[PDB]
Amino acid sequence: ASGPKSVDFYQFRVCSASITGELFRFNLEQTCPDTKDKYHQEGILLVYKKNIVPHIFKVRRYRKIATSVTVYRGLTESAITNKYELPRPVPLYEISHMDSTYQCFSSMKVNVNGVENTFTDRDDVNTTVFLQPVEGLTDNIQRYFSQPVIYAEPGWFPGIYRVRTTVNCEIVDMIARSAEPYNYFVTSLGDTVEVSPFCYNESSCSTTPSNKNGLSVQVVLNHTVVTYSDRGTSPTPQNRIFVETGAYTLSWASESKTTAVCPLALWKTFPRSIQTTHEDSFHFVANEITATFTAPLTPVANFTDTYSCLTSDINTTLNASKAKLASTHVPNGTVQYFHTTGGLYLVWQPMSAINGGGGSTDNLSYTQLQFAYDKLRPGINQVLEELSRAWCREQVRDNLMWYELSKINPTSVMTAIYGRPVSAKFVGDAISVTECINVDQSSVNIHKSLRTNSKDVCYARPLVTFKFLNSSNLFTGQLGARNEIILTNNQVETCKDTCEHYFITRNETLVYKDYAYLRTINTTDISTLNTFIALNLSFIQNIDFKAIELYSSAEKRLASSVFDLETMFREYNYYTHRLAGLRED
Amino acid sequence: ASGPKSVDFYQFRVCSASITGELFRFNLEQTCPDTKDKYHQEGILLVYKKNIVPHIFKVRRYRKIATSVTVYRGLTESAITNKYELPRPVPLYEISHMDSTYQCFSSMKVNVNGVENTFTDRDDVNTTVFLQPVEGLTDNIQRYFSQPVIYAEPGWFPGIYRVRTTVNCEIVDMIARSAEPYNYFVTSLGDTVEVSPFCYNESSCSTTPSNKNGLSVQVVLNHTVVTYSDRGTSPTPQNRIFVETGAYTLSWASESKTTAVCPLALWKTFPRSIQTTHEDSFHFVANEITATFTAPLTPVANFTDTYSCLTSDINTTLNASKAKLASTHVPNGTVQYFHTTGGLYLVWQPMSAINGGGGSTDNLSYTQLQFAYDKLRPGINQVLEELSRAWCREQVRDNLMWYELSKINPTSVMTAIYGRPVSAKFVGDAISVTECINVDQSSVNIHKSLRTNSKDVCYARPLVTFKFLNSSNLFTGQLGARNEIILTNNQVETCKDTCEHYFITRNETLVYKDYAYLRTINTTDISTLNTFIALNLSFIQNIDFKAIELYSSAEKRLASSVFDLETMFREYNYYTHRLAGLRED
Amino acid sequence: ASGPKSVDFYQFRVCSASITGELFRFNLEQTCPDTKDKYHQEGILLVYKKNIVPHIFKVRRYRKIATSVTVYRGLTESAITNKYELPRPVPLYEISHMDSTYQCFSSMKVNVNGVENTFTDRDDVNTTVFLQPVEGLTDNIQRYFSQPVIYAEPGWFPGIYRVRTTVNCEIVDMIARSAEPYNYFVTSLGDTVEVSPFCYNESSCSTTPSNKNGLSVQVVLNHTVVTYSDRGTSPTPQNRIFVETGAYTLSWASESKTTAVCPLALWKTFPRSIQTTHEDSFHFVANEITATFTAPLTPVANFTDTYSCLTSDINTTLNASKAKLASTHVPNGTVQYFHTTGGLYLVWQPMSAINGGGGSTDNLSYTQLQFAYDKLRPGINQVLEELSRAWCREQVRDNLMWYELSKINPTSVMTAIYGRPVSAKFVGDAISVTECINVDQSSVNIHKSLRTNSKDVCYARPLVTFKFLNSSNLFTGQLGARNEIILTNNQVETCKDTCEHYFITRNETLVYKDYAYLRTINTTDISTLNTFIALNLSFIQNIDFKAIELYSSAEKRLASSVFDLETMFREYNYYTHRLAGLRED
Ligand SMILES: *[C@@H]1O[C@H](CO)[C@@H](O[C@@H]2O[C@H](CO)[C@@H](O[C@@H]3O[C@H](CO[C@H]4O[C@H](CO[C@H]5O[C@H](CO)[C@@H](O)[C@H](O)[C@@H]5O[C@H]5O[C@H](CO)[C@@H](O)[C@H](O)[C@@H]5O)[C@@H](O)[C@H](O[C@H]5O[C@H](CO)[C@@H](O)[C@H](O)[C@@H]5O)[C@@H]4O)[C@@H](O)[C@H](O[C@H]4O[C@H](CO)[C@@H](O)[C@H](O)[C@@H]4O)[C@@H]3O)[C@H](O)[C@H]2NC(C)=O)[C@H](O)[C@H]1NC(C)=O
Ligand SMILES: *[C@@H]1O[C@H](CO)[C@@H](O[C@@H]2O[C@H](CO)[C@@H](O)[C@H](O)[C@H]2NC(C)=O)[C@H](O)[C@H]1NC(C)=O
Ligand SMILES: *[C@@H]1O[C@H](CO)[C@@H](O[C@@H]2O[C@H](CO)[C@@H](O)[C@H](O)[C@H]2NC(C)=O)[C@H](O)[C@H]1NC(C)=O
Ligand SMILES: *[C@@H]1O[C@H](CO)[C@@H](O[C@@H]2O[C@H](CO)[C@@H](O)[C@H](O)[C@H]2NC(C)=O)[C@H](O)[C@H]1NC(C)=O
Ligand SMILES: *[C@@H]1O[C@H](CO)[C@@H](O)[C@H](O)[C@H]1NC(C)=O
Ligand SMILES: *[C@@H]1O[C@H](CO)[C@@H](O)[C@H](O)[C@H]1NC(C)=O
Ligand SMILES: *[C@@H]1O[C@H](CO)[C@@H](O)[C@H](O)[C@H]1NC(C)=O
Ligand SMILES: *[C@@H]1O[C@H](CO)[C@@H](O)[C@H](O)[C@H]1NC(C)=O
Ligand SMILES: *[C@@H]1O[C@H](CO)[C@@H](O)[C@H](O)[C@H]1NC(C)=O
Ligand SMILES: *[C@@H]1O[C@H](CO)[C@@H](O)[C@H](O)[C@H]1NC(C)=O
Ligand SMILES: *[C@@H]1O[C@H](CO)[C@@H](O)[C@H](O)[C@H]1NC(C)=O
Ligand SMILES: *[C@@H]1O[C@H](CO)[C@@H](O)[C@H](O)[C@H]1NC(C)=O
């Protein structure tokens, strides 16, 4: 026969399983994979923020005030011409009684350029007097005075001046505060003190007085101070620091830096949370917040030596949390510490069923967006695994439908599983498969008649005459299948009174009736069955998100204070220099 | 026959539908479910923020200023030695003319410790004088003066001092402001007044003067004030409050708290929005913002009595919104009020087609994340419903393919629908199904030949000899199907010149040709057809989100003011106490 | 025959392909669509923020201070009665030497109301003296003085006063700053200057002095200033501005507005980013941030003329970025500029493989939420395209299973592809299809027996007698299929000893055995096969997101300063007016 093997359904061809081809078998007894197993670890999670508030402590301020008024007796009239005020500090010989028993000496002495000035209340004798309270606006501040009334009696002889002078003792009790570098502190009344509040424990002080330009500093040991309930059951001794600036004395009780302040504070605690491991990081889940916190794969070393000041709090918080779960869970592993990109610190303790970034970010939105994405992702990936084993259990039945169809005739199954024409035959329980041979398009002609030379026999398919490539002798058969040449003839039972056919070729159809040919008609004129099932899936669609604000930048400005400092200081400078000042003309 | 029933395809067995087994029927005329119906309610949504700005009102301040300068005539030279200033309040006998006609009395009297001081401009006679404007830096502040020039003429006789004195009247017109507890207010020039701005309507005042330490307070009825356009068409009478602190008099017009301020403000309004009900909450949708607001299932009671001050605004806003939709929608139900976790208040009005949390959260990101999640979720759940009815319409056709295959032989369909060997037979329009019986593995032997004792008949399957368990007599048949024993023989039409077979057993294959046995070969040597269609689905993948900031914490600090208050007050204290002050040595 | 065509399987009917009906063909040689192609453009992206920091520059302040002290010699005692201070500006004849060589004239003259006052240090002669440094608290401020010590020696004769007077020269070197409208500037020590810092380049100044109420302003050309290293290699000349307010002289070096400040600053640069086009906008992607920025479809015009001050920076940044990619990419198109809703500006440069909104939003969360949504959406839409071509390749095999089943008998395939009974016949390679005819329910009766009048022939289906609508003559056949009447009879091979049947009708079943009828039984008593495969898909579920804060509104307040301005100014007003002031009684 001819050389070229068939590769499409368009050329005329001769097929036969007449040779020892390749053998195939239906591989029955398949199975789909089983359901996977998935696991996770529970534990206690504690979350730490970096601290932000200033340090806050109580202080006392001691002063003596000298005042001088100039008055003019005049005649039938009198006036104040001036009033001057001079504050000064208080020495330790007096602070003793002034904080013990609320007494002071009604007079003062002031060295200036090496000469001694003196001031005495109402020009009377140096004598001891008692301090008493005065009313206040703000409940955290208390104030005590020795003499509420300024002296301005005009005097007895007409036409000349006199000077009137007074002395006060003052105590104030109030708050003071300071921030991260601890170089200085600021008092509630606005006094700025320029000494570190821990300075004795940093060994920057002594019982012998220290000195600086504009300061003297000392520590007094076993000092005692009495509350104005003024009662003999005196408070316990302390060590107290004393600062003697120009214009006042100030004092506070000594304390250590590492007991006073620690850099971190507890934000929240979750007694049930889960750890999952990814390619580059760990994820820790907090359901009550709707958030997840991530961290690098390596825990932070030395969190017992750096931040050692937390060792009071993590132990009691883990011990209380473990005692709450002790009926259902028991600890595993050991305590671990992690630092989140974003600036938070995590404490973790694994549980089993019993059966750096100093710029801490203020906005936590990325922790909630991670929780939403990690709830969508496994919810979608579970549908893909449930869809894929429902598909595989169908392909195991399709392979049995093709097996039962193959026992009827195996050729029509092989040219359905392959995309190309082949011929096939059973040789036992295995199927032998074989190539098919092309025949030339020009030797092929189809006969115009179907009734036989016998009186009552009719061909069910039209006769065809042909020859192979590179040959002279002719051959004949019947037009079979799509465009096949069949070598063995077949017939209808009788040439019954009426008959019709529409034989189909690759392009055209031949129409026959009364056992003879009539016309050639295009195949597209015959209507075609549709057996397909439509999906009509609708795809996800685009959204543009918007920038939104609850309060305007102006409303955020006006809410910050009732004071308008930007205009308050501009008017004070304009008034005191241009309007009210001495001015040339 | 033997007792044990077949449970796999590996042991040799005898099957027959020779007994009255159970009956089965193909249940034709199935259907898939129909498409569901889904519904939602439209309405108008108004959203309220808690208010944040201070209260703002106009005030007047009245003062008299006495000044005294000391000058020294000297000889061939002269200098100022001192300048002192004394502000005082203004009494009602003068405020009358001073706010009516812009006049004041050019002199003042000052009681101190029970004696009367007097100050007069340039030592001249007590006389009436007119106030006039002066220029200002800030456009909200106006200032008026009676005498712009301070007096410092040195005098005529050498070598002795003199005192020069002046008196001013001042008015200032300006803003003042106050915040949430309303205990006090602060003036634009920095004066703090320590009285509540509504105090007469709270019955904390009277027409008889009230008193406090450092204050006097009074209400004046039917008071009148004239604008500096100074024109006879005088403004309408008012009730005005007067405060007389040390150093000034201050006044403002009386007003009621419930007309002055209300705690909430309207943020946005949506004329088309949708309500959906979930297991624990309601969700309200705003498309123009790309956001959704949630609330508890119970509306807030008494929002007409608490927040009654909004009853002017919600009525006109709902009436305008309803009139905008009146061509396509008509109201249903009644107005309802809800409080969102996050601190916003919602107003809702249902429409039909015609056919607490005082910590208000500043960042609205959770409202946009809820809108994105509620756009993904129903978009994915719609694909699952469209995929599930496309699958069911295919299973209704697979059930018809198995029916048409069963009419050819029902055994091969029953052992495809069940996972196990059984035998089956039609008894009418119903199929009778029956168990199959195991035979021992040791009595089975397969014959080495296929040609019969007849001269031209050949067996299509090899002969087998066997016996049942607990028996002596032998039996024979043909090797059928996978590993079956068949009791009725079958043959090929003729012993044609050439023949070949590859019979398959559970492990091994037997090869025969020329109608006799030759070899045993492993089944895995025969190539197997693959008819499966691959899915190749690709799963969703992990993303790590990052912390991001547009401006540094330092840039947010430097943007807050041009004033550097942290260093401005430190230098003023250092200069006035250490550098410039009187200092001992 | 009767008129009504069959529309269900419930009525009895007669079917035959006895007429020339419509022709159908199996449309083989189908294909599914091929895989789509998808494309995107890479480029360099630069992102610009609006600037927020104030302008910052160096200044000098020059002063002369006159002081006067009053002291009383007295007897056996002495005291200070007053101390007064008077600051004044410095004239250009002196600023020359004072900034060149650090010298000043130890005396001053002060015009007031047209008469000249004079002050001289310690009453000594007018002489030149040298300035020297003093220590400072804050490292950005330097201060120089001519006389550190105030003079207060009491004097020699008992019982009378004397006045002591001193003069200082002061220089201060420090920072000053100003903001967006540029109307004024504020010095580090709190001095507010009320002149624009660029005023000479805006032609608001001259070398002839300008004047305002309370100011004089001048520009000095080629001025020179010497650093206190005080060395003959003098710095280069400048043009310097001079302001002469009351109480001081102040100076700064002249500069142009367009070189000093530009409104925008570079935030980040991405050398690989991608542009995608949507229905109304463009999206630009930044992977290292996990964010995408959107913009309108039209680029902004005139960004080379408005914001021309950026032309130094975008050129060098694009040139450096292009040189980094020059081994793998080459430029295409040209540079384009876009303005994002949210207030950022984008610069874009396309690359190829070689082979307005002044309210800038501070919170970028919407840019990360867009990146998450645009990672979910194409990840889900890819699964729908991979699922849809896996479905289509199966429907192309189902169409071949129906073709092979149709060659056995075409009726049972046509009533599976249609939902209704029809009859069909092959007329060649095409199938002729025909309607079926209803018969009345009352003429139908089923015979009680199956054995024939012949001695050993039995009917496989029971006999039926019937007639057509509007007729008298009777007909007979066999009960076939579901509820069909068949006109041609068929039989079992022999009336074998035992036989049983369960014939099924639309409601009831008839049971027969020993070739005769016995009972009528409901069809539901016969057990039915189940061949369906379950999906068990589980749908996505609802989540309620929460409002979260890292720091309380109180902690955000307390972190803003160590100063408590809200109480500091309230106590100063209470103390100086009520407690310490002159008060009537
Ligand atoms: C105690 O005693 C001391 C003295 O020991 C007193 O100090 C004296 O104070 C008086 C005023 O009270 C001074 O009198 C006045 O002098 C000025 C300056 O005159 C000279 O400079 C003028 C400007 O030239 C500048 O620019 C040129 C370049 O163009 C430059 O070369 C100069 O160096 C100069 O300075 C500038 O450049 C410097 C270097 O870069 C800079 O540092 C500097 O800041 C400048 O930028 C110049 O025009 C003038 O020439 C004319 O006038 C002089 C007289 O001064 C005359 O001799 C010439 O013939 C010219 O006609 C000088 O070179 C001067 O300008 C003043 O004149 C004005 O004011 C009067 C009214 O007072 C008007 O009538 C005039 O019209 C004019 O407006 C005045 O003469 C005195 O000089 C000064 N002495 C010293 C040593 O400095 C102190 O006041 C006493 N205190 C008490 C309390 O008693
Ligand atoms: C500063 O204060 C700390 C805390 O009080 C001191 O540390 C203590 O030192 C004593 C003696 O070694 C120990 O017994 C305590 O346990 C320590 N406490 C802590 C918390 O450290 C420290 O010695 C002080 N330093 C100085 C020099 O005063
Ligand atoms: C405080 O002000 C309110 C508001 O003006 C006063 O309430 C009014 O009272 C009158 C008389 O009963 C009513 O007619 C008005 O309708 C009320 N208005 C409102 C808005 O309440 C209240 O009486 C005043 N209280 C005092 C004591 O002055
Ligand atoms: C203000 O300053 C700007 C910048 O120095 C001046 O503009 C310059 O003008 C000169 C002369 O035309 C040009 O050669 C420069 O190229 C310009 N530079 C810039 C950046 O503009 C401007 O002339 C000044 N205006 C005045 C009146 O002084
Ligand atoms: C005819 O059939 C051939 C394939 O053999 C096809 O390529 C062509 O498009 C068809 N149409 C005609 C009639 O050319
Ligand atoms: C926790 O419990 C253990 C065992 O009682 C105890 O030793 C430890 O001090 C506790 N830690 C704290 C402080 O909670
Ligand atoms: C042989 O078949 C049995 C099942 O009957 C199977 O378990 C075994 O793995 C197969 N292989 C052999 C030859 O043991
Ligand atoms: C709304 O309209 C009704 C009917 O006109 C009216 O009674 C009611 O006062 C209106 N409310 C407001 C203030 O909008
Ligand atoms: C109000 O809403 C309910 C529920 O949707 C509906 O049954 C009823 O008909 C509506 N009535 C009006 C007035 O639209
Ligand atoms: C009987 O069959 C009819 C359809 O022909 C059906 O509508 C009905 O529900 C069935 N049940 C009976 C016995 O009524
Ligand atoms: C970029 O490079 C070109 C070519 O060298 C040059 O002309 C241009 O000035 C450069 N721009 C800058 C400033 O980077
Ligand atoms: C520029 O881009 C367009 C569109 O992708 C492309 O057709 C063209 O070839 C590109 N040219 C260069 C220079 O890469």
Residue numbers in the entry:
A (entry chain B), B (entry chain C), C (entry chain A): 54 to 408, 448 to 677
Sentences from the paper on this structure:
KSHV is a member of the gammaherpesvirus subfamily and is the causative agent of several devastating diseases, including Kaposi’s sarcoma, primary effusion lymphoma, and multicentric Castleman’s disease. Glycoprotein B (gB) is the fusogen responsible for the physical action of membrane fusion and is conserved across all herpesviruses. As a class III fusion protein, gB undergoes a conformational change from a prefusion state to a postfusion state that draws the host and viral envelopes together to induce fusion. Here, we report the first structure of the KSHV gB ectodomain determined by single-particle cryogenic electron microscopy (cryoEM).
To alleviate this issue, we truncated the sequence and determined the structure of the soluble ectodomain of KSHV gB (amino acid residues 1–687). Of the homologous mutation sites at the DIII central helix, D470P was selected for structural determination for its expression level and charged sidechain. The structure of KSHV gB was determined at 3.3 Å resolution by single particle cryoEM. The gB structure was reconstructed as a homotrimer with C3 symmetry aligned along the long edge. KSHV gB ectodomain exhibits an elongated rod-shaped architecture with dimensions approximately 70 Å by 70 Å by 170 Å, consistent with the postfusion conformation observed in other herpesvirus fusion proteins, such as those from HSV-1, VZV, HCMV, and EBV. The KSHV gB follows a canonical postfusion domain organization of the class III fusion protein, with its core comprising three β-strand-rich modular domains (DI, DII, and DIV) and a long three-helix bundle of DIII. Of the 13 hypothetical glycosylation sites per protomer based on consensus sequence in KSHV gB, 10 sites displayed the densities for glycan chains. Notably, the glycan at N179 showed an extended sugar chain density, corresponding to up to eight sugar molecules, including two branching points. In general, the folds of each domain are nearly identical between herpesvirus species, but we observe that a loop in DI of KSHV gB at residues 252–270 deviates greatly from all currently known gB structures. The DIV trimer region exhibits a rotational movement around the three-fold symmetry axis, while the remaining ectodomain (DI-DIII, DV) remains largely static.
